[PDB]
């Protein structure tokens, strides 16, 4: 974890973990709030 | 001293490159050896005369072929149902179906149908018979012969003009604005009034009856007495048929605006007044600069005196008069920048405001005439930017331009390139993301989920022009504005009737697809401007290579060291932006041809539903209109579009052939030609034949130029064919 977490903090893994979370969030926004063309707020 | 004789360094080249580069360095007169100022300007002056002679010997043969092999009189009898014939075809390779299929327009043999709008032009201007066009062809043969005599004359040492005559910018501007732009538009007005208006009204005015056929009922009396409104007294009515005396008026200079209701074209009385106005204002504007008589301006002191005192422009324009006057590439770049912005103003104002009789009804001719001036203008504008780059290498002196506006462009050049980069990236992500989003929503069965943006700024400008379709009702669409009440008795009864019509192309009804392709257009202009401003401002040097000015303009590279320096030159930025002008004007003319190809057959809803996503562009425009294009010749037979079906495939050859020069690079072909040279030098019966030029591969700049020119020839021939076969085979 002095070097395992260093590998986990690298540029491709952190891009995979962020965009996995980012596309995971935007899909789950698009399930409970789908077809969103106009922001009502 | 072999060919080329203007460059000594290429004459000692023992390879084929000497043959090639001598063609391509032929007109780069300032790069020649033993070369001076006087020879530069006199060779450029005689080359201008040769260019004028070529233009007039071109027009003479485009008039001779209409007068000889074209049915100009038969098109004058019925301009709606007769195809205009360019010239006859004598091809030894035609079979009998090709002779029987290219015979159009009631001709005696196989002929080519003219899509250049020369019949509409010559009809509107006053030419009626074939004898008038033949006399014009002989007259312009004489004019081109006179320009050849004048070009030969100014290379003779008795009539050689000095560089001080050539760099006399004030006298050149006064005699250009007064003579070229003023007395020629006043000459025009004298034609349009003497000849073209009575030939629109049935009167046959020629040189034999020029001094007897009075253009007005009271001619030159009300002109010199001040009452000019007599020349706007009795205009042509809406029942006027073009070329006939019935329904016609007597006024020569009207201000009606709008269109002639039968031709859907501009009024010759309005264009006569237009030319009397751009003739008075150009002769008055030609008395501006100081030449010989004490009054006038010195432009050096105008540019010296135009310095903002806050120092935001530095020294302002001090030292710019000598910068333009000494640099021919600055003047040529300014001339090509203005020429591109007016060749595009030509293209935008001859489709929406058709100036020639029965030009709006002939659809494929209008399509050709828009695509012509938008491609000639996207090569003239890129030539302007390329000549700005050549100015910054071989003509820009940083000592003479010390802290002026031109030096300050180099001072903040990374800001300009980075902000053009931001604007191009913004337009690209947004236009591509919205088109790809609308593609996904039409793919996913939901057309309603598109991001469709109504272009309300340009729709507000159209309602500011007088379009009552959107209901903004601000000015010229509302009766409560002072601009409307200042215009409603003067020009707006013609203009509002022309702009509220939905069949013409005057300020068309735009939608979300128009918004999206206008951002495609802004992407194209912004990215082409990005590459070209980047080439012009990194012309002298950059952080990768600071001595780009000492390597010339069109040098290939600087070697594989320092990471790699491929396409580092400013010519290579011009090279990369020729692809961007081709893509830009391809998008522009795709939008034009599909907005009009749906207007002309009526269903504008096809464009209004399908232009917002790229599968509509691929399917309903590139695939749907190409139905009778590629069926121009079949196994079953061949049609009259067959030459346009071959020229389409021909474009797909040449364009793809350019890829051979743009992807594969030199040293592969150099080792290949080394093996070929061994094979020729060792083959029995063929070794006896020698080469004098050593066979080499195409050099790197030459390779980029040859691939670029092939790309451009294929690109202009694939679209000239598709555009002149998907409108002329399915008229409408």
């Amino acid at each position: 974890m002095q070097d395992v977490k260093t590998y986990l903090s690298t540029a491709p893994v952190l891009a995979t973990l962020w965009f996995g979370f980012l596309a995971g969030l935007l899909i789950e926004i698009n399930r409970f709030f789908p077809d969103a063309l106009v922001l009502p707020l | 001293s072999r060919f080329p004789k203007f460059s000594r360094g290429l004459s000692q080249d023992p390879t084929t490159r000497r043959i090639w580069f001598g063609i391509a360095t032929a007109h780069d007169f300032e790069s020649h050896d033993d070369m001076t100022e006087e020879r530069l300007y006199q060779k450029i002056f005689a080359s201008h005369f040769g260019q004028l002679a070529i233009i007039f010997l071109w027009t003479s043969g485009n008039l001779f072929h209409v007068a000889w092999q074209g049915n100009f009189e038969a098109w004058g009898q019925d301009p709606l149902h007769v195809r205009p014939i360019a010239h006859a075809i004598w091809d030894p390779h035609f079979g009998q179906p090709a002779v029987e299929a290219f015979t159009r327009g009631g001709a005696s043999g196989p002929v080519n149908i003219a899509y250049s709008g020369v019949y509409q032009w010559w009809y509107t201007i006053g030419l009626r018979t074939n004898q008038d066009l033949y006399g014009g062809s002989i007259f312009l043969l004489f004019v081109s012969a006179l320009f050849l005599i004048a070009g030969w004359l100014h290379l003779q040492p008795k009539w050689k003009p000095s560089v001080s005559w050539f760099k006399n910018a004030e006298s050149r501007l006064n005699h250009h604005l007064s003579g070229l732009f003023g007395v020629s538009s006043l000459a025009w007005t004298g034609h349009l009034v003497h000849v073209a208006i009575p030939e629109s009204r049935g009167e046959h005015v020629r040189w034999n009856n020029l001094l007897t056929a009075l253009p007005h009922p009271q001619g030159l009396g009300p002109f010199f007495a001040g009452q000019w409104n007599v020349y706007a007294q009795n205009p042509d009515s809406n029942s006027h048929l073009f070329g006939t005396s019935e329904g016609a008026g007597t006024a020569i200079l009207t201000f009606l605006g709008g269109f002639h209701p039968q031709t859907q074209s501009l009024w010759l009385t309005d264009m006569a007044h237009h030319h009397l106005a751009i003739a008075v204002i150009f002769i008055i504007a030609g008395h501006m600069y100081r030449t010989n008589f004490g009054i006038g301006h010195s432009m050096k002191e105008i540019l010296e005196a135009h310095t903002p005192p806050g120092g935001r422009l530095g020294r302002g324009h001090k030292g710019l008069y000598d910068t333009i006057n000494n640099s021919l590439h600055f003047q040529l770049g300014l001339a090509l920048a203005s020429l591109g912005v007016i060749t595009s103003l030509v293209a935008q104002h001859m489709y929406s405001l058709p100036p020639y009789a029965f030009l709006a009804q002939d659809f494929t001719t209008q399509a050709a005439l828009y695509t012509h001036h938008q491609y000639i203008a996207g090569f003239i504008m890129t030539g302007a930017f390329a000549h700005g780059a050549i100015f910054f290498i071989r003509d820009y002196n940083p000592e003479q331009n010390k802290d002026n506006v031109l030096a300050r462009m180099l001072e903040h050049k990374e800001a300009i390139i980075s902000h053009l980069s931001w604007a191009s990236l913004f337009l690209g992500f947004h236009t591509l993301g919205l088109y790809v989003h609308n593609d996904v929503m039409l793919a996913f069965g939901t057309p309603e989920k598109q991001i469709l943006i109504e272009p309300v700024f340009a729709q507000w400008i159209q309602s500011a022009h007088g379009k009552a379709l959107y209901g903004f009702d601000v000015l010229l669409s509302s009766a409560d504005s002072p601009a409307f009440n200042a215009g409603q008795t003067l020009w707006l009864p013609g203009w509002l009737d022309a702009i509220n019509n939905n069949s013409n192309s005057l300020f068309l009804t735009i939608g979300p697809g128009d918004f999206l392709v206008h951002h495609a257009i802004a992407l194209g202009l912004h990215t082409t401007t990005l590459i070209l401003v980047k080439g012009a401002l990194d012309a002298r040097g950059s952080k990768l290579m600071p001595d780009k000015k000492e390597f010339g303009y069109s040098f290939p590279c600087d070697g594989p060291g320092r990471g790699g320096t491929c396409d580092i030159s400013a010519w290579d930025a011009f090279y990369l932006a020729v692809f961007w002008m081709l893509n830009t004007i391809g998008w522009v003319t795709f939008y034009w041809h599909w907005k009009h190809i749906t207007l002309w057959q009526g269903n504008v809803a096809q464009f209004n539903e399908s232009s917002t996503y790229l599968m509509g562009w691929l399917r309903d425009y590139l695939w749907l209109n190409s139905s009778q294009l590629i069926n121009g010749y079949n196994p079953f037979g061949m049609n009259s579009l067959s030459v346009w079906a071959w020229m389409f495939l021909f474009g797909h050859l040449v364009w793809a052939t350019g890829f051979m020069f743009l992807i594969s690079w030199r040293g592969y072909w150099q080792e290949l030609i080394e093996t070929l040279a061994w094979a020729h030098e060792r083959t029995p019966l063929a070794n006896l034949v020698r080469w004098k030029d050593k066979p080499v591969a195409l050099s790197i700049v030459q390779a980029r130029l040859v691939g670029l020119a092939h790309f451009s020839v294929g690109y202009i021939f694939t679209y000239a064919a598709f555009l002149i076969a998907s409108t002329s085979g399915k008229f409408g």
């Binding site: 260093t6 903090s9 690298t10 540029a11 952190l14 789908p34 077809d35 063309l37 106009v38 922001l39 009502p40 707020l41 | 940083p398 030096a407 180099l410 001072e411 050049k413 990374e414 069965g445 939901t446 057309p447 309603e448 989920k449 598109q450 991001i451 469709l452 943006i453 109504e454 309300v456 700024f457 729709q459 507000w460 379709l469 959107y470 209901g471 903004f472 939608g511 979300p512 990194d538 002298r540 040097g541 950059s542 952080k543 600071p546 809803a605 209004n608 539903e609």
Partner: protein, 160 residues
Amino acid sequence: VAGLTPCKESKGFAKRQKQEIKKLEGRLKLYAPDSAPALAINATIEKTKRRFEFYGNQGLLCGTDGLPHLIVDGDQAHLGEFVYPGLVFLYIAGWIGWVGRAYLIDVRTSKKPTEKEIIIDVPLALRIMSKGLTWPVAAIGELRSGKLVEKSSNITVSPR
């Protein structure tokens, strides 16, 4: 506005709702009514009917194509088409731009500044990704204090 009818009273927008359910109802005719693929098309129809009843209730403008058009000029009726989600976007996009700018300042004053960009220091990153919440007050605060922009004497400039 701009010659566009509202989508709640647009006959073309109601026509697209009619021909979308009818496309999905004909897809439902070849399945059993209690089957698993028929529940997906039944959920598709209720997703379609939720979508068309949401577009008409937001005051969307529908053209002659029966499609909702966005007015991006800044109309008081049309704020949620461009202005409201644009300010929502620029806050999020400025959050991305502020925590990436503040990370580079935090790793430029380090022992090996290039190893902190291939290997992103997550305790250093996550302590400023929270700090990107209040970024208009920190960007214009750095703009007013002069810390946002660098003077041109300390900026690498290519020669003329």
